[PDB]
Tab-separated table of C-alpha atoms and ligand atoms in Angstrom:
chain	number	residue	atom	x	y	z
A	1	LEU	CA	-5.461	7.119	23.024
A	2	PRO	CA	-1.778	7.590	23.801
A	3	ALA	CA	-0.684	11.236	23.705
A	4	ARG	CA	2.588	10.393	21.858
A	5	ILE	CA	0.510	8.691	19.169
A	6	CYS	CA	-2.128	11.433	19.002
A	7	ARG	CA	0.798	13.713	18.046
A	8	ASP	CA	3.186	11.512	16.076
A	9	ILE	CA	0.432	9.861	13.921
A	10	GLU	CA	0.320	13.079	11.862
A	11	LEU	CA	3.936	12.539	10.788
A	12	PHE	CA	4.333	10.847	7.427
A	13	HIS	CA	7.059	8.671	8.875
A	14	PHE	CA	4.827	7.374	11.710
A	15	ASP	CA	5.379	3.688	12.602
A	16	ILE	CA	2.432	1.886	14.120
A	17	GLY	CA	4.459	-0.147	16.633
A	18	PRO	CA	4.571	-3.806	17.751
A	19	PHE	CA	1.320	-3.939	19.740
A	20	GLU	CA	-1.093	-5.659	17.316
A	21	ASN	CA	-4.043	-5.029	19.641
A	22	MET	CA	-3.529	-1.225	19.257
A	23	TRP	CA	-3.830	-1.241	15.414
A	24	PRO	CA	-7.651	-1.388	15.283
A	25	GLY	CA	-8.002	1.809	17.394
A	26	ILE	CA	-5.219	3.497	15.485
A	27	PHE	CA	-7.290	2.829	12.380
A	28	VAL	CA	-10.595	3.999	13.957
A	29	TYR	CA	-8.938	7.209	15.146
A	30	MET	CA	-7.731	7.798	11.573
A	31	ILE	CA	-11.165	7.142	10.099
A	32	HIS	CA	-12.841	9.282	12.823
A	33	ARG	CA	-10.395	12.158	12.141
A	34	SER	CA	-10.505	11.790	8.335
A	35	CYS	CA	-14.104	10.937	7.570
A	36	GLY	CA	-16.186	11.734	10.620
A	37	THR	CA	-17.259	10.374	13.992
A	38	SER	CA	-20.897	9.633	13.026
A	39	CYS	CA	-20.059	8.547	9.452
A	40	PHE	CA	-19.419	4.923	10.508
A	41	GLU	CA	-21.268	2.905	13.161
A	42	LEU	CA	-18.565	2.076	15.774
A	43	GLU	CA	-19.663	-1.429	16.696
A	44	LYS	CA	-20.050	-2.554	13.044
A	45	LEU	CA	-16.777	-0.909	11.930
A	46	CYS	CA	-15.105	-2.538	14.907
A	47	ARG	CA	-16.019	-6.015	13.714
A	48	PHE	CA	-15.416	-5.289	10.055
A	49	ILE	CA	-11.878	-4.376	11.178
A	50	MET	CA	-11.533	-7.595	13.241
A	51	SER	CA	-12.712	-9.763	10.343
A	52	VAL	CA	-10.229	-8.144	7.923
A	53	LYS	CA	-7.388	-8.855	10.310
A	54	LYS	CA	-8.468	-12.521	10.627
A	55	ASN	CA	-8.250	-12.903	6.844
A	56	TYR	CA	-4.673	-11.595	6.590
A	57	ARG	CA	-1.928	-14.256	6.813
A	58	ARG	CA	1.218	-14.667	8.963
A	59	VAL	CA	3.625	-13.777	6.187
A	60	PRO	CA	6.804	-11.757	6.764
A	61	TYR	CA	5.792	-8.595	4.905
A	62	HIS	CA	2.308	-8.603	3.168
A	63	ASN	CA	0.540	-8.925	6.517
A	64	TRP	CA	-1.901	-7.029	8.825
A	65	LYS	CA	0.846	-4.681	9.922
A	66	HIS	CA	1.397	-3.669	6.308
A	67	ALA	CA	-2.320	-3.159	5.824
A	68	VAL	CA	-2.657	-0.658	8.693
A	69	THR	CA	0.623	1.037	7.719
A	70	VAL	CA	-0.482	1.644	4.102
A	71	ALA	CA	-3.741	3.013	5.627
A	72	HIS	CA	-1.752	5.354	7.809
A	73	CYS	CA	0.178	6.745	4.824
A	74	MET	CA	-3.114	7.396	3.080
A	75	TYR	CA	-4.333	9.209	6.282
A	76	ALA	CA	-1.252	11.417	6.242
A	77	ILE	CA	-1.973	12.137	2.459
A	78	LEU	CA	-5.557	13.073	3.232
A	79	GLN	CA	-4.977	15.150	6.369
A	80	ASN	CA	-2.380	17.232	4.499
A	81	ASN	CA	-4.684	17.837	1.484
A	82	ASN	CA	-7.911	18.948	3.173
A	83	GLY	CA	-10.561	19.829	0.635
A	84	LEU	CA	-9.211	17.900	-2.345
A	85	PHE	CA	-11.003	14.624	-1.815
A	86	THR	CA	-14.669	14.019	-1.240
A	87	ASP	CA	-16.122	12.390	1.906
A	88	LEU	CA	-16.766	9.274	-0.181
A	89	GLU	CA	-13.204	9.034	-1.540
A	90	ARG	CA	-11.862	9.484	1.989
A	91	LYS	CA	-13.991	6.629	3.360
A	92	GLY	CA	-13.338	4.294	0.402
A	93	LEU	CA	-9.598	4.907	0.292
A	94	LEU	CA	-8.972	4.294	3.970
A	95	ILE	CA	-10.884	1.048	3.672
A	96	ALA	CA	-9.264	0.099	0.376
A	97	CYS	CA	-5.825	0.461	2.013
A	98	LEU	CA	-6.878	-1.694	4.993
A	99	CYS	CA	-8.191	-4.364	2.603
A	100	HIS	CA	-5.834	-4.148	-0.344
A	101	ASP	CA	-3.590	-7.191	0.424
A	102	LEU	CA	-6.328	-9.413	1.923
A	103	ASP	CA	-5.283	-13.074	1.964
A	104	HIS	CA	-1.845	-12.373	0.420
A	105	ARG	CA	0.332	-15.480	0.601
A	106	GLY	CA	3.733	-13.784	0.063
A	107	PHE	CA	3.888	-14.559	-3.667
A	108	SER	CA	3.828	-12.345	-6.763
A	109	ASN	CA	1.393	-12.504	-9.663
A	110	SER	CA	4.166	-13.998	-11.826
A	111	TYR	CA	4.642	-16.844	-9.406
A	112	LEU	CA	0.913	-17.713	-9.343
A	113	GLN	CA	0.954	-17.730	-13.178
A	114	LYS	CA	4.025	-19.947	-13.517
A	115	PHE	CA	2.571	-22.186	-10.776
A	116	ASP	CA	-0.715	-22.546	-12.716
A	117	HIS	CA	-2.571	-21.485	-9.536
A	118	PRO	CA	-6.403	-21.648	-9.693
A	119	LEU	CA	-6.622	-17.871	-8.951
A	120	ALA	CA	-4.685	-17.244	-12.169
A	121	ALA	CA	-7.268	-19.138	-14.272
A	122	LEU	CA	-9.981	-16.991	-12.653
A	123	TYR	CA	-8.215	-13.573	-12.797
A	124	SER	CA	-5.784	-13.383	-15.766
A	125	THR	CA	-4.571	-9.892	-15.050
A	126	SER	CA	-3.725	-8.328	-11.729
A	127	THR	CA	-4.474	-11.748	-10.197
A	128	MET	CA	-3.988	-11.216	-6.468
A	129	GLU	CA	-5.471	-7.724	-6.524
A	130	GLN	CA	-8.769	-8.966	-8.060
A	131	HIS	CA	-8.832	-11.616	-5.305
A	132	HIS	CA	-8.218	-9.013	-2.574
A	133	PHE	CA	-11.227	-6.965	-3.763
A	134	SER	CA	-13.332	-10.111	-3.991
A	135	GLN	CA	-12.417	-10.901	-0.365
A	136	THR	CA	-13.222	-7.332	0.621
A	137	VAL	CA	-16.711	-7.702	-0.846
A	138	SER	CA	-17.096	-11.033	0.914
A	139	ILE	CA	-16.196	-9.430	4.269
A	140	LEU	CA	-18.753	-6.593	3.623
A	141	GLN	CA	-21.549	-9.092	2.802
A	142	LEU	CA	-21.040	-10.949	6.062
A	143	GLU	CA	-23.872	-10.204	8.425
A	144	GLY	CA	-23.042	-7.323	10.776
A	145	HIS	CA	-20.159	-6.191	8.559
A	146	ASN	CA	-21.751	-3.732	6.121
A	147	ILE	CA	-20.018	-0.585	7.295
A	148	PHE	CA	-21.618	1.058	4.270
A	149	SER	CA	-25.254	0.250	5.268
A	150	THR	CA	-26.171	3.924	6.074
A	151	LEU	CA	-25.601	4.621	2.413
A	152	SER	CA	-27.822	4.839	-0.645
A	153	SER	CA	-27.564	1.902	-3.050
A	154	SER	CA	-25.963	4.215	-5.616
A	155	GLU	CA	-23.430	5.649	-3.120
A	156	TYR	CA	-22.640	2.010	-2.056
A	157	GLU	CA	-21.907	0.939	-5.646
A	158	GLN	CA	-19.830	4.169	-5.975
A	159	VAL	CA	-17.635	3.533	-2.907
A	160	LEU	CA	-17.109	-0.141	-3.896
A	161	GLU	CA	-15.950	1.048	-7.332
A	162	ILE	CA	-13.592	3.538	-5.671
A	163	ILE	CA	-12.330	0.690	-3.471
A	164	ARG	CA	-12.045	-1.651	-6.469
A	165	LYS	CA	-9.891	0.692	-8.561
A	166	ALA	CA	-7.653	1.627	-5.638
A	167	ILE	CA	-6.994	-2.054	-4.750
A	168	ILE	CA	-6.312	-2.901	-8.385
A	169	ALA	CA	-3.959	0.084	-8.619
A	170	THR	CA	-1.732	-1.590	-5.961
A	171	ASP	CA	-0.618	-4.006	-8.737
A	172	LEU	CA	2.777	-2.314	-9.218
A	173	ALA	CA	2.806	-3.438	-12.890
A	174	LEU	CA	0.015	-0.889	-13.584
A	175	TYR	CA	1.945	1.930	-11.886
A	176	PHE	CA	4.413	2.390	-14.720
A	177	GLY	CA	1.741	3.203	-17.275
A	178	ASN	CA	-0.253	5.326	-14.819
A	179	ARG	CA	2.718	7.383	-13.854
A	180	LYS	CA	3.757	7.994	-17.477
A	181	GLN	CA	0.237	9.228	-18.293
A	182	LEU	CA	0.268	11.551	-15.212
A	183	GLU	CA	3.727	12.910	-15.931
A	184	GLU	CA	2.628	13.952	-19.438
A	185	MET	CA	-0.496	15.608	-18.002
A	186	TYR	CA	1.615	17.501	-15.458
A	187	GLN	CA	4.010	18.825	-18.058
A	188	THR	CA	1.429	19.771	-20.739
A	189	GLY	CA	-0.633	21.338	-17.929
A	190	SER	CA	-3.568	19.055	-18.952
A	191	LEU	CA	-4.253	17.341	-15.554
A	192	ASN	CA	-7.798	18.117	-14.468
A	193	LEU	CA	-9.009	17.158	-11.028
A	194	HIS	CA	-12.557	18.011	-12.101
A	195	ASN	CA	-12.343	15.051	-14.549
A	196	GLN	CA	-13.233	11.660	-12.940
A	197	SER	CA	-10.971	9.622	-15.245
A	198	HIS	CA	-8.080	11.909	-14.115
A	199	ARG	CA	-9.061	11.596	-10.430
A	200	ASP	CA	-8.862	7.752	-10.885
A	201	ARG	CA	-5.210	8.134	-11.998
A	202	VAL	CA	-4.305	10.373	-9.065
A	203	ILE	CA	-5.806	7.925	-6.569
A	204	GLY	CA	-3.961	5.128	-8.325
A	205	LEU	CA	-0.715	7.014	-7.804
A	206	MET	CA	-1.683	7.672	-4.208
A	207	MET	CA	-2.312	3.907	-3.697
A	208	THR	CA	1.202	3.200	-5.106
A	209	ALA	CA	2.822	5.864	-2.907
A	210	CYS	CA	1.172	4.421	0.196
A	211	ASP	CA	1.891	0.812	-0.723
A	212	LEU	CA	5.589	1.588	-1.146
A	213	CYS	CA	5.791	3.746	1.938
A	214	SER	CA	8.476	1.680	3.748
A	215	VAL	CA	10.924	3.743	1.713
A	216	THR	CA	9.593	7.032	3.238
A	217	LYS	CA	10.070	6.144	6.953
A	218	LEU	CA	13.213	7.089	8.873
A	219	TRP	CA	16.263	4.912	8.105
A	220	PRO	CA	16.084	2.478	11.074
A	221	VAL	CA	12.467	1.648	10.166
A	222	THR	CA	13.175	1.416	6.413
A	223	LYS	CA	16.210	-0.825	6.840
A	224	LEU	CA	14.311	-3.186	9.167
A	225	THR	CA	11.270	-3.397	6.945
A	226	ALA	CA	13.527	-4.233	4.034
A	227	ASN	CA	14.449	-7.450	5.933
A	228	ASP	CA	10.844	-8.519	5.748
A	229	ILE	CA	10.393	-7.532	2.100
A	230	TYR	CA	13.404	-9.672	1.079
A	231	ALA	CA	12.272	-12.525	3.329
A	232	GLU	CA	9.261	-12.943	0.971
A	233	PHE	CA	11.332	-12.279	-2.196
A	234	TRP	CA	13.766	-15.110	-1.205
A	235	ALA	CA	10.981	-17.495	-0.292
A	236	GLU	CA	9.506	-16.847	-3.747
A	237	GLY	CA	12.887	-17.348	-5.339
A	238	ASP	CA	13.138	-20.732	-3.512
A	239	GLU	CA	9.713	-21.687	-4.880
A	240	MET	CA	10.797	-20.660	-8.393
A	241	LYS	CA	13.908	-22.908	-8.193
A	242	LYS	CA	11.554	-25.688	-6.978
A	243	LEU	CA	9.578	-25.229	-10.230
A	244	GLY	CA	12.648	-25.487	-12.467
A	245	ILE	CA	13.179	-21.717	-13.037
A	246	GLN	CA	16.142	-19.456	-12.245
A	247	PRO	CA	14.533	-16.543	-10.298
A	248	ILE	CA	15.746	-13.002	-10.966
A	249	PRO	CA	18.555	-12.110	-8.520
A	250	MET	CA	16.195	-9.910	-6.507
A	251	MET	CA	14.498	-13.132	-5.427
A	252	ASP	CA	17.636	-15.370	-5.217
A	253	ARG	CA	18.881	-15.668	-1.619
A	254	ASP	CA	22.320	-16.746	-2.968
A	255	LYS	CA	22.595	-13.141	-4.215
A	256	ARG	CA	21.723	-11.538	-0.861
A	257	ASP	CA	24.900	-9.460	-0.798
A	258	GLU	CA	23.600	-7.464	-3.789
A	259	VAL	CA	20.624	-6.050	-1.833
A	260	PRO	CA	22.149	-2.538	-1.695
A	261	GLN	CA	22.555	-2.449	-5.496
A	262	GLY	CA	19.035	-3.830	-5.646
A	263	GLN	CA	17.779	-0.903	-3.563
A	264	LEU	CA	19.614	1.654	-5.761
A	265	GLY	CA	17.671	0.114	-8.652
A	266	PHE	CA	14.262	0.254	-6.983
A	267	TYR	CA	14.690	3.809	-5.693
A	268	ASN	CA	15.884	5.265	-9.015
A	269	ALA	CA	13.420	3.438	-11.265
A	270	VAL	CA	10.342	3.302	-9.027
A	271	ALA	CA	10.298	5.193	-5.702
A	272	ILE	CA	11.867	8.550	-6.564
A	273	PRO	CA	9.711	8.951	-9.757
A	274	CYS	CA	6.599	7.790	-7.811
A	275	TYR	CA	6.959	10.360	-5.005
A	276	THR	CA	8.194	13.033	-7.460
A	277	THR	CA	5.088	12.755	-9.554
A	278	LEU	CA	2.984	12.651	-6.382
A	279	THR	CA	4.606	15.830	-5.026
A	280	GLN	CA	3.980	17.591	-8.374
A	281	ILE	CA	0.252	16.850	-8.127
A	282	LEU	CA	-0.081	17.220	-4.335
A	283	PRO	CA	2.674	19.525	-3.028
A	284	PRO	CA	2.010	18.806	0.741
A	285	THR	CA	3.209	15.168	0.196
A	286	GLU	CA	6.778	16.495	-0.205
A	287	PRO	CA	7.962	14.902	3.134
A	288	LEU	CA	7.425	11.477	1.508
A	289	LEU	CA	9.809	12.411	-1.292
A	290	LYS	CA	12.344	13.971	1.103
A	291	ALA	CA	12.464	10.794	3.246
A	292	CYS	CA	12.787	8.634	0.121
A	293	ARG	CA	15.823	10.675	-1.034
A	294	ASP	CA	17.381	10.397	2.453
A	295	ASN	CA	16.937	6.624	2.294
A	296	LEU	CA	18.500	6.431	-1.172
A	297	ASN	CA	21.476	8.280	0.321
A	298	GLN	CA	21.705	5.659	3.144
A	299	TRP	CA	21.709	2.779	0.657
A	300	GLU	CA	24.465	4.765	-1.112
A	301	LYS	CA	26.545	4.870	2.125
A	302	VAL	CA	25.995	1.125	2.601
A	303	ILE	CA	27.551	0.286	-0.793
A	304	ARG	CA	30.841	1.959	0.164
A	305	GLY	CA	31.016	0.622	3.746
A	306	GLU	CA	29.836	3.629	5.780
A	307	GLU	CA	26.240	2.294	6.328
B	401	227	C1	11.889	-1.441	-1.121
B	401	227	O1	12.409	-2.377	-2.068
B	401	227	C2	11.634	-2.943	-3.041
B	401	227	C3	10.231	-2.895	-3.018
B	401	227	C4	9.520	-3.490	-4.049
B	401	227	N1	8.196	-3.458	-4.010
B	401	227	C5	7.487	-4.173	-4.894
B	401	227	N2	8.026	-4.641	-6.039
B	401	227	C6	9.365	-4.717	-6.172
B	401	227	N3	9.860	-5.363	-7.358
B	401	227	C7	8.994	-6.172	-8.224
B	401	227	C8	8.180	-5.302	-9.209
B	401	227	C9	9.080	-4.354	-9.955
B	401	227	C10	8.595	-3.771	-11.112
B	401	227	C11	9.380	-2.902	-11.840
B	401	227	C12	10.677	-2.606	-11.409
B	401	227	C13	11.166	-3.184	-10.226
B	401	227	S1	12.910	-2.720	-9.813
B	401	227	O2	12.969	-1.396	-10.223
B	401	227	O3	13.301	-2.820	-8.452
B	401	227	N4	13.938	-3.785	-10.704
B	401	227	C14	13.550	-3.823	-12.129
B	401	227	C15	14.672	-4.581	-12.841
B	401	227	N5	14.840	-5.921	-12.270
B	401	227	C16	16.013	-6.563	-12.897
B	401	227	C17	15.029	-5.955	-10.809
B	401	227	C18	13.967	-5.123	-10.109
B	401	227	C19	10.373	-4.062	-9.498
B	401	227	C20	10.879	-4.694	-8.215
B	401	227	C21	10.161	-4.128	-5.144
B	401	227	C22	11.563	-4.171	-5.134
B	401	227	C23	12.288	-3.601	-4.113
B	401	227	O4	13.649	-3.622	-4.154
B	401	227	C24	14.397	-4.348	-5.165
B	402	MG	MG1	-0.732	-6.077	-2.866
B	403	ZN	ZN1	0.488	-3.832	-0.041
């Protein structure tokens, strides 16, 4: 409802605030405005949302707040590209974002593998992401929760496949390959949005851009969210030491003073290329890239004192 939110939710750098009880209706507004008002049945969507929340954990960063925030980014990169994505893609992607870290425990796929976690045995590749999709499907199959019930069986299978690929694409390991393939398409002029295999890549890149979106907010938000990101990284580093393994410095709390250098690394190697390639394919997403560059600059001031 709020008027300040009705306005500021269109900004890419929107922050969803500290009131957890407002997040559901922020998400329903977004879906209403993106997809339609009669496209989802309110009462069923409302409980689907509540059940997703319940299945997210009280971790510092990969939590319910993150889930709604990634959804908001995707809303801003749907609103600003009217006519490029189908009604089905718009429904699936908003839901994929809300669901994409379901039951995340604050640990990377490497750590589950080195820990010999049961989930690893089950899903060899992209371990957590396969689990998230599996949990999404389980939420949908719960009675009263099939937000997709108004849909043909074929359209159902289609949206679940859109959701599946988008969730899987949040495995940052896949991004590097995806982005390389897209960058060659851009430059040879071979990218074809009429081609479904190419559309899959573009959505994958969109899922990355949205998942990383802490680095596109204004500096006070970005800096604060970074505290939560490192809180998980350090906890994982502690768990790695407990296994008998020196963690990379990124995850070693004893190397906390190198966070600024760490951020230079991440922005140059990951974030700037991600949002550059995104901007090349979808020019209206330029504000994401601009904010990312501003944030890189801030990390650059921090290294030399200025902050
Ligand atoms: C907003 O801040 C974030 C957000 C991040 N989001 C998610 N993954 C992050 N990880 C793990 C997956 C991954 C894959 C490929 C490259 C990187 S890297 O470029 O940062 N760098 C590679 C070289 N290594 C020695 C140290 C890390 C990362 C870093 C990350 C890291 C991060 O700041 C450090
Ligand atoms: Mg994830
Ligand atoms: Zn995420």
